[model samples]
Target: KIPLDLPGTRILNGANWANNSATENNSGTLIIFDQSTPGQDADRWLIHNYLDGYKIFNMGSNNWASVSRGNTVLGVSEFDGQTCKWSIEYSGNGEEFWIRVPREGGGGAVWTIKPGPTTVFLDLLKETDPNQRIKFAVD
Candidate 1:
């Protein structure tokens, strides 16, 4: 379940963008170091899904990264004709899957809030696992 487009690459923030205000490092801005770049430099990104339900973390540990509420938008990326599959639903979204490199036990999982009626039920589920939940930010 390797990510078909951005495999073997790391993610970057907008910390180095010139005229930083136009595209400065802030919440929800992501850059990718495309393995295919000629200068081996950073490239723009397109975040595939919009999530706010909290905590898509490394499976090996319980540690979670804080994400903006209603974390929508993919920023910008070059036209490579490359494609990845993502399904949309009332709750959340993600890449259909991810792949782990050999000789390692990295990890992969896809999840979303899956919005519900009145939203009371979603809160109940969150209450069940406060340590694993992130408060929602509706887009």
Candidate 2:
């Protein structure tokens, strides 16, 4: 499971902000992105102060991109009317990774980790047999 941390007094859904209360003092917005397919495209991309929920811009049949909108605070894009910080931790094998948006107050960093095959068969087996214990050997 991927862990995401959004530190802010209040959190808002990009899709719906007009009807929500804006009492909490948020630093910015946090948006999460997942690849349409495994081993393809960037691992994750986040946009701060996004106008809408996470959007995946498809450039072409096999190409895609993403974007986030907001104000510039200290050189970073702070979502429209909120201030906040965000981070993500994922467990898997991947080569390329990037975070379009970083945490507030600085100390945010981009990451790129090597990729390798994981034991996914066991997960698939569980879908078929609830009581079956599946295993895969590494070579």
Candidate 3:
């Protein structure tokens, strides 16, 4: 359970995230690139469905969404258990969140790659980088 509204709650929702100098966008379908600063709440996401598991919802689509993509192409999609299930790790009041999708075959870690803070993608295991983590956020 995501400790929302509780003592353990995290104010992650409504906060903007940027990596590789670019921020994310909703724009009908969610996309990440070029936007150095988020324009509005549309760029903000509500961490959804904590009663079930981790999910992110955008402005237009109310359903739970998650970071999803296969081997490459960092993406966000509506609840698809196989792809949308995300693991959130917290420790020592850590501001950073380690986000990853688990897979059954070789090299399970979904690496986050940021080429010059201009783009973000999940690809290849053992391709470790701090950007792969939904790392420390600043409000």
Candidate 4:
């Protein structure tokens, strides 16, 4: 069993898989790119799900090359009935982050590059308690 609350718990959930190579059962890292500064390389964020033997997934920078072809490079899960659409919004000062879980089929939902602290929280929860009852407070 893992600790109930882990460090870096806030940065996990809002992350999207930046590349198309992620599978359901593999270790991958999440990368958040700095769009404000061009030519700067993407930043790497690690995500490990220990329950599944640390199946890793990598979320990386937005691929401009794919966008040029009118394709979305971000990894997005399909709108399955079990999959709720969630978003993260930052305060004006960028110090605070708020999450919004939209009702299914809602056209408006906040999306961000910086998924905030709750991301880490959710990811850890899922990793630690894969079979336990887990719910997002935002939902």
Query: Which model scores highest in TM-score?
Result: 3
Steric overlap count per candidate: 9, 7, 1, 20
lDDT of 4: 0.25
RMSD of each: 16.3, 17.5, 6.7, 15.8
lDDT digits (tens) for residues 1-139 of candidate 2: 2212221111111111101111124232222212222322222222333342222211111111212242221111323223233233222223112222344553443221112111111111112231221111111
68-131, model 4: which lDDT tens digit per residue? 0121123222322222223333433323332233334433222233321111212211212322
- lDDT winner: 3
**Candidate 1 residue-wise lDDT, 65-105, digit = tens:** 22223432222222111112222112222222211111123
TM-score of 1: 0.17
Better of 2 and 3 by TM-score: 3
Which lDDT values do the candidates have, in the order given?
0.21, 0.22, 0.40, 0.25
Q: Higher-TM-score candidate among 3 and 4? A: 3
Considering summed lDDT, which 10 consecutive residues are worst modelled in model 1? 116-125
Candidate 3 ranges with C-alpha deviation above 4 Å: 1-30, 33-39, 49-52, 60-70, 73-78, 91-93, 103-108, 111-113, 124-128, 135-139
The ten-residue window of minimal lDDT in model 2 covers 14-23
Error of 2 at 112 (Å): 1.2
